[PDB]
């Protein structure tokens, strides 16, 4: 059972299911671009001072530890926000895609059908796999069944 974005069909043939490849893929690509971007953040690492010796320079080493501790915290917060912003963009792209799927289910199958306002429609004609597959393929013509 593939697909992520797709269509349904009720009717007398029972229920039937088919997937919109492009809508599925673009949702995917959005997530993969974010993953790549988050995987390629460049942050400098922290090492010891080369000049500061143990026993001799304990006071400096305490400050060094302090600089590191505050830096880790800052970078953590900075990275956390990046993830929160990524999730924001991914979730928002969902609504763009869904709305675009409704406008496609409104361009096809003509005015002979009536919209439930549910993402779902009530059609005059029967559907089933083949007819639903053409809706998924974007090749469905209403005029098959002599309709507007």
């Amino acid at each position: 059972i593939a697909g992520w974005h797709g269509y349904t069909s009720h009717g007398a043939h029972g229920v039937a299911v088919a997937a919109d490849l492009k809508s599925t893929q673009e949702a995917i690509n959005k997530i993969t671009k974010n993953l790549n971007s988050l995987s390629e953040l460049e942050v400098k690492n922290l090492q010891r001072l080369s000049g500061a010796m143990d026993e001799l320079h304990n006071e400096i080493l305490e400050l060094d530890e302090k600089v590191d501790d505050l830096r880790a915290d800052t970078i953590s917060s900075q990275i956390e926000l990046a993830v929160l912003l990524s999730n924001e963009g991914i979730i928002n792209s969902e609504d763009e895609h869904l709305l675009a799927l409704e406008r496609k289910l409104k361009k096809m199958l003509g005015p002979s059908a009536v919209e439930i306002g549910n993402g779902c429609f009530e059609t005059k004609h029967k559907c089933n796999q083949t007819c639903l597959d053409r809706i998924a393929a974007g090749t469905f013509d209403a005029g098959e069944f002599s309709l507007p």
Partner: antibody
Amino acid sequence: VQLVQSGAEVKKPGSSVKVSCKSSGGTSNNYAISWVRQAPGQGLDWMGGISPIFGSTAYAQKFQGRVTISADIFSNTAYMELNSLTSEDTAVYFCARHGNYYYYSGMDVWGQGTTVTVSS
Amino acid sequence: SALTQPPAVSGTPGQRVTISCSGSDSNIGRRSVNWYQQFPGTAPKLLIYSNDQRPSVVPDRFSGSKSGTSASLAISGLQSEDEAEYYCAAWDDSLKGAVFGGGTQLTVLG
């Protein structure tokens, strides 16, 4: 993108092998990758495939139970592990990327090709 | 196997040659066909996808078609460099897996 399969392998019958693919110059994580083998003088044969962001792994019936296909999305790498090896498994292994997230599209890119020779 | 192609085809330089692929309802019938070209000792390349679509790198002398549970590749204006093995392929909804033809060797006389 360029996809580099792993080195050549020599295995004892019954052991297994692992074959890793690596794509260089971009990720392939948003696409399906299949594994395809070719016995000497013989044709292409699908083993199964994987689509790591989608979350799917699929297998050819003739290899079900004996092959394991996997991926590490963080290193942009895919793997194939084949168990219970037999002289019948001596052939060239091919990994390829598909045009989309699933196995329907025509695999447009492939590896240079892994060759694994079984014997004792 | 699953899809069946002739083991051999031949022609003379510049002629048109065709290679057929017979399947069933469970593969070619309900899914798209892809074609691949392979030279000896190298990996396969994609020649045709979605029944009738070429990659940008593929010459337009290559064309494909699909009818019923069958498919066909046609090569117009044969050249000497087209000598190679050819494989057809499709998803099969009964086996739930990808299938391939046995391969066809094309020989360029001359």
